[PDB]
Write an enzyme that holds these catalytic residues in place. Structure first.
Site, mmCIF file in Angstrom:
data_model
loop_
_atom_site.group_PDB
_atom_site.id
_atom_site.type_symbol
_atom_site.label_atom_id
_atom_site.label_comp_id
_atom_site.label_asym_id
_atom_site.label_seq_id
_atom_site.Cartn_x
_atom_site.Cartn_y
_atom_site.Cartn_z
ATOM 1 N N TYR B 18 0.834 -1.199 0.000
ATOM 2 C CA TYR B 18 0.000 0.000 0.000
ATOM 3 C C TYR B 18 0.874 1.256 0.000
ATOM 4 O O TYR B 18 2.077 1.177 0.259
ATOM 5 C CB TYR B 18 -0.940 -0.009 1.210
ATOM 6 C CG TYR B 18 -0.245 0.302 2.516
ATOM 7 C CD1 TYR B 18 0.543 -0.659 3.156
ATOM 8 C CD2 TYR B 18 -0.362 1.557 3.108
ATOM 9 C CE1 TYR B 18 1.181 -0.382 4.349
ATOM 10 C CE2 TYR B 18 0.280 1.841 4.296
ATOM 11 C CZ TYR B 18 1.048 0.861 4.914
ATOM 12 O OH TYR B 18 1.695 1.142 6.092
ATOM 13 N N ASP B 127 5.100 -11.865 3.497
ATOM 14 C CA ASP B 127 5.340 -11.408 2.128
ATOM 15 C C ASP B 127 6.833 -11.326 1.809
ATOM 16 O O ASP B 127 7.316 -10.395 1.144
ATOM 17 C CB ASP B 127 4.603 -10.087 1.852
ATOM 18 C CG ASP B 127 4.368 -9.843 0.358
ATOM 19 O OD1 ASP B 127 4.316 -10.809 -0.429
ATOM 20 O OD2 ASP B 127 4.245 -8.699 -0.102
ATOM 21 N N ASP B 145 8.665 -3.794 3.882
ATOM 22 C CA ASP B 145 7.236 -3.919 3.550
ATOM 23 C C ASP B 145 6.459 -4.878 4.453
ATOM 24 O O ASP B 145 6.158 -6.021 4.073
ATOM 25 C CB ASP B 145 7.000 -4.257 2.073
ATOM 26 C CG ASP B 145 5.590 -3.850 1.614
ATOM 27 O OD1 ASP B 145 4.755 -3.502 2.486
ATOM 28 O OD2 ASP B 145 5.227 -3.839 0.420
#
Ligand code: N76
Ligand code: MG
Lengths: 256, 297
Positions: B18, B127, B145
């Site tokens: 995002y 992730d 991230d």
């Protein structure tokens, strides 16, 4: 599985994440009873949207920490609670309710703009520190020490831990790990006659003696539960999901 | 402590889970930073709420440092330490030289340190991929991230199913296990270890079934012997082809005995048997580990 590391870390963080024990006395316009009404309502909201128990515990932590530094008028307490539940849901839930659902459940007491502005304010005041240890996170570790696993014990401990959320006096003075210790022992004793296990003395450093003050409070809360002005937790724990544990009779004595 | 006033924007870096990331410079201290900008609907996104709360707890040399959060009513800016490059680009740049083994070993060692730290603080990354692993000129590699990250509990309950970039996604997620935990991040790192050695993704599937079948053709189709409970998993089908397991020396041919041993433990089917990041730090593969600068830039 990092079980020891994580337990140690939560024991550090719960001290850091603890609300101020004396805050209600320093709030001009709100009382313990108003807080009781709020948390009981949040239990209902949790049931309505089938939210995790963890989500409920987190929201109450956010509220008490917020109210530890921010003076709040009675007409705005629900707005604080609502934003706290929205944040807890975003943090903890796979599918949090939409903001509009949270607006709807106040029955249009507040606008979406007000809820969203309060969300931002709560984040500011808590400095985004939302990953707080709960009674629930400790209980869940303690359950691993059962011999053998008992569903009634688990659900009843969760029920008792939840009751503590309602009453800032006295439960604000106890750490989540201690309430959980007391809830687990009280549950285990009620159901099986067994006591706080030796393996948990080794894990936590807590004994029946150190848990005694919390235990005596929790026992009284348990005995008086059917007469409490707030009943949403008792009603919730009648459900088969929690094996109907609120229908179990509390022990008359603990013999500690 | 910050304000947008003292930051000078340099250039766009990219878009992660995002928001958008920019390179910037603090005009007063000279510090070069990465700025993650979040336009503020549904209020503050859950990904931001999680990334910020968890990164504030996770201070470690192999986790990207969140320095500040600058909060306007319309804009949220995350101020991060700046790193020079991502691992994917570095692997691309190493096309003809290869990555020296001391550097692969150092990077894996550091990734495991960073990961053990997350897991010991009850955080799943979910992730891990080369694009999210950032390097500097001094030899560091860091986890970045944390938009897909979450705080877990002991023991875990069911979390979001749609997790981990497909190529790096563990078999237990692919097969629909009710429970996944820290082992998912180790799986990803094991894929990344192989990728640093071959410079190509180990399991580049384009659907969930293709992904599973690529894994099966490499590691063998799992049975109840290798992975008790596999056949009762939600998305297991008795019709799965039964591929024989390959000689691991053929999976990543440049790897020597110790490297192969470690990779095989990171790619063990049974999450219970799969090696923890903590345990992997003491693997004989790392006996001569150092921290050399990247051979390029
Ligand atoms: N060669 S380059 O253009 O300067 C360059 C290239 C790649 C990464 C950086 N530095 C960098 N990037 C981040 O996110 C980049 C983002 C990661 C996830 C996927 C989309 C992109 C950071 N988050 C904190 N610190 C960060 N540092 C610099
Ligand atoms: Mg008062």
């Amino acid at each position: 599985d990092y079980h020891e590391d994580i337990h140690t870390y939560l024991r550090e963080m719960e001290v850091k994440c603890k609300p101020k024990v004396g805050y209600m006395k320093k709030q001009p316009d709100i009382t313990n009873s108003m807080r009781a009404i709020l948390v009981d309502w949040l239990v209902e909201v949790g049931e309505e949207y089938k939210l995790q128990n963890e989500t409920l515990h987190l929201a109450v932590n956010y509220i008490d920490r917020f109210l530890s530094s921010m003076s709040v008028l009675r007409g705005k307490l629900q707005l604080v609670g609502t934003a706290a539940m929205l944040l807890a849901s975003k943090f903890e839930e796979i599918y949090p309710p939409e903001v509009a659902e949270f607006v709807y459940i106040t029955d249009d007491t507040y606008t979406k703009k007000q809820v969203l502005r309060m969300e931002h304010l709560v984040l500011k005041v808590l400095t985004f520190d939302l990953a707080a240890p709960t009674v629930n996170q400790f209980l869940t570790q303690y359950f691993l020490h059962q011999q053998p696993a008992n569903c009634k014990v688990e659900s009843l401990a969760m029920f008792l831990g939840e009751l503590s959320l309602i009453d800032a006096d006295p439960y604000l003075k106890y750490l989540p790990s201690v309430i959980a210790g007391a809830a687990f022992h009280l549950a285990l004793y009620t159901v099986t006659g067994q006591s706080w296990p030796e393996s948990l003395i080794r894990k936590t450093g807590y004994t029946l003696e150190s848990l005694k003050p919390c235990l005596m409070d929790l026992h009284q809360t348990y005995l008086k539960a059917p007469q409490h002005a707030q009943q949403s937790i008792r009603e919730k724990y009648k459900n088969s999901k929690y094996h109907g544990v609120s229908l179990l009779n509390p022990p008359e004595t603990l013999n500690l | 402590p910050g304000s947008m006033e003292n930051f000078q924007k340099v250039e766009k870096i990219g878009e992660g889970t995002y928001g958008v990331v920019y390179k910037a410079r603090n005009k007063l201290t000279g510090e070069v930073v990465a700025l993650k900008k979040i336009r503020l609907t549904e209020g503050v996104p859950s990904t931001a709420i999680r990334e910020i709360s968890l990164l504030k707890e996770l201070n470690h040399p192999n986790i990207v440092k969140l320095l500040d959060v600058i909060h306007t009513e319309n804009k949220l800016y995350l101020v991060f330490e700046f790193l020079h490059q991502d691992l994917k680009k570095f692997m691309d740049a190493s096309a003809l030289t290869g990555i020296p083994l001391p550097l692969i070993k150092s990077y894996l060692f550091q990734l495991l340190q960073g990961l053990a730290f997350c897991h010991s603080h009850r955080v799943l990354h979910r992730d891990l991929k080369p694009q999210n692993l950032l390097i500097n000129t001094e030899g560091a590699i860091k986890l970045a991230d944390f938009g897909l990250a979450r705080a877990f509990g002991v023991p875990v309950r069911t979390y979001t199913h749609e997790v981990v970039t497909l190529w790096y996604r563990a078999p237990e997620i692919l097969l629909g296990c009710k429970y996944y935990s820290t082992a998912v991040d180790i799986w990803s790192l094991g894929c990344i270890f192989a990728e640093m050695v071959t410079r190509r993704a180990l399991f580049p599937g384009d659907s969930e079934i293709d992904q599973l079948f690529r894994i099966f053709r490499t590691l063998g189709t799992p049975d109840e012997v290798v992975w008790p409970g596999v056949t009762s998993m939600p998305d297991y089908k008795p019709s799965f082809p039964k591929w024989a397991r390959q000689d691991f020396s053929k999976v990543v041919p440049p790897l020597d005995e110790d490297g192969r041993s470690l990779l095989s433990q990171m790619l063990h089917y049974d999450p219970n048997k799969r090696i923890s990041a903590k345990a992997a730090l003491a693997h004989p593969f790392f006996q001569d580990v150092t921290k050399p600068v990247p051979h390029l830039r």
